[PDB]
Amino acid sequence: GTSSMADIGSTNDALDYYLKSKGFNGLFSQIELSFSASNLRDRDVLSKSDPMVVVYQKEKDATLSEVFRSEVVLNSLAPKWIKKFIVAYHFETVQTLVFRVYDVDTKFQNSREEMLKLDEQQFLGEATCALSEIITKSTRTSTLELKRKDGFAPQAQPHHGKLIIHAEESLASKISTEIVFRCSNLESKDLFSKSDPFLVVSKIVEHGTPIPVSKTEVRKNDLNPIWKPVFLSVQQVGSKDSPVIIECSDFNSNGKHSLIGKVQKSLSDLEKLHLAGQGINFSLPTGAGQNKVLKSQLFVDKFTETVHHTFLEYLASGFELNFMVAIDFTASNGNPRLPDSLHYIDPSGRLNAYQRAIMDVGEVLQFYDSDKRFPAWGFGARPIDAPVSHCFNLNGSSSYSEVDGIQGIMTSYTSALFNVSLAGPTLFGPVINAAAMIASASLAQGSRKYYVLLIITDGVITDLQETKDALVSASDLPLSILIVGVGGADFKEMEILDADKGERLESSSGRLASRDIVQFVALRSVVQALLAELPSQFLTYMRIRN
Ligand SMILES: [Mn+2]
């Protein structure tokens, strides 16, 4: 291998960071709801029924898809259903579900539930909620009153019983496999030199290039390397019986690394090797369809399937996501009273871009905080009689920034719009510090809050340096940040801040960010993808924190 200790050191440093950012990546989470009911009644009388719960998925257009259907419990005054419903959990979307309980006619006592027509059974009642509402309860159990439409009666509308939903993250979806590889007698292609070897584990595609899934650090002048542990979830590999590619390569600082050897084996195959203590010989390709078995061998020194502490594990341990908002009130935007102002409050009730982004994000994150007291700021405006503020409370107080609910944010916003003077220029430093001050204070008081600040701007920032410095400093606190650009401005300068598109942030004082905490996108939903990254950031913090 050709490279300096410095070239190696730094490619390893790049890897460490990338791993902490992707985490024990990609155990895409699944929930098991299980069901039971009490007091099922078509009218005012409770007698043995034959209950069945049926679960629909509510689309935004309010359309209903059937996604599950319990078995029929026979002759019961309180059924406890055996059949569980496994639904995927998507942190980035509200998953509205609708539950419907039916009293199955007795003539069907021998029918498989799949075969039942619901028109032919007694509809007892219905309830609705988001998945988010069930998995954020301490007991992970909700109790919902089944209701029917009796015509029109929000108060004295009769009950038809209670439906009781228990949610549990499914064990299989929490499993990752730690592996420690070791090789034996590696030969570099570069003759008369020792190898600087690393390993790449790649999922197999059919008729296209294999997708790298994991990578070991590079070791200097080692012919019998024992790497640090790499971790693999089942979704990264496919199934435990799915063959993967393991390539051993010789590192070259010039970026073109040379293949040392390659084997193809499943994660199951590796386990058998581990237990047996046996190694397997590597191969190189030679003839466009033949391979050569090397003297060099691969070994699996360690191999442990573990239950990884997942996002949902933390939520069930009483950890919250607390939403914060900061809104550009720079004149960039145009007078609120102008139809083509980005802050125009349409009389018809149509949301502007700031309202859209607030809802798109808040609507989801509101379920992960129990108090729903959300700090709300504006920046770049002149309040009555004062100079320009770069962090004033939207609610218009002097002492506190919290507002009640998304609703509270929306009314604080429309309120501020007509009680201050859009000014300038566009600065992010002060709000980020304000947020950090709150994060920090929460950390010191041993709270279990992690904070998500949404910043919405119409142009590019002025204080790019003092922003980096604030972010870098914030990276140690329980705080993620999402920036959303609105209107048609050129946001090119913003992309240096994005976790994905940008680069690891450097303080002016030289210090580096512990982790990626910023994302940016232009609201040309596109928000969904911003939300999808937060769990990872969330967990990164929890790993790193000290
Ligand atoms: Mn602006």
Swiss-Prot record:
GO MF entry, a single one: calcium-dependent phospholipid binding
Reported induction: Down-regulated by high temperature. Up-regulated by pathogen, calcium, low humidity, avirulence gene product avrRpt2 and salicylic acid.
Pfam families recorded: C2, Copine
Keywords: Calcium, Cell membrane, Lipoprotein, Membrane, Metal-binding, Myristate, Plant defense, Repeat
Domain of life: Eukaryota
One Gene Ontology biological process: defense response
Reported impact of D105A: No effect. Loss of function. Loss of function, but no effect on targeting
Tissue expression pattern: Expressed in roots and flowers and, at higher levels, in leaves and stems. Strongly expressed in growing tissues. Not detected in green siliques.
Gene3D superfamilies to which the protein is assigned, alphabetical: C2 domain (2.60.40.150)
Loss of function: phenotype: Dwarf, twisted leaves and enhanced disease resistance in cv. Columbia when grown at 22 degrees Celsius. No visible phenotype when grown at 28 degrees Celsius, or in cv. Landsberg erecta, cv. No-0, and cv. Wassilewskija at any temperature. Humidity and temperature sensitive lesion mimic phenotype, accelerated hypersensitive response (HR) and increased disease resistance. Bon1 and bon2 double mutants, as well as bon1 and bon3 double mutants are seedling-lethal when grown at 22 degrees Celsius. bon1, bon2 and bon3 triple mutant is seedling-lethal at any temperature.
Cited PROSITE patterns: C2 (PS50004), VWFA (PS50234)
Domain description: The N-terminus (1-116) is sufficient for plasma membrane localization. VWA domain fragments interfere with the function of the full-length protein, triggering a lesion-mimic phenotype.
Similarity section: Belongs to the copine family.
Protein name: Protein BONZAI 1
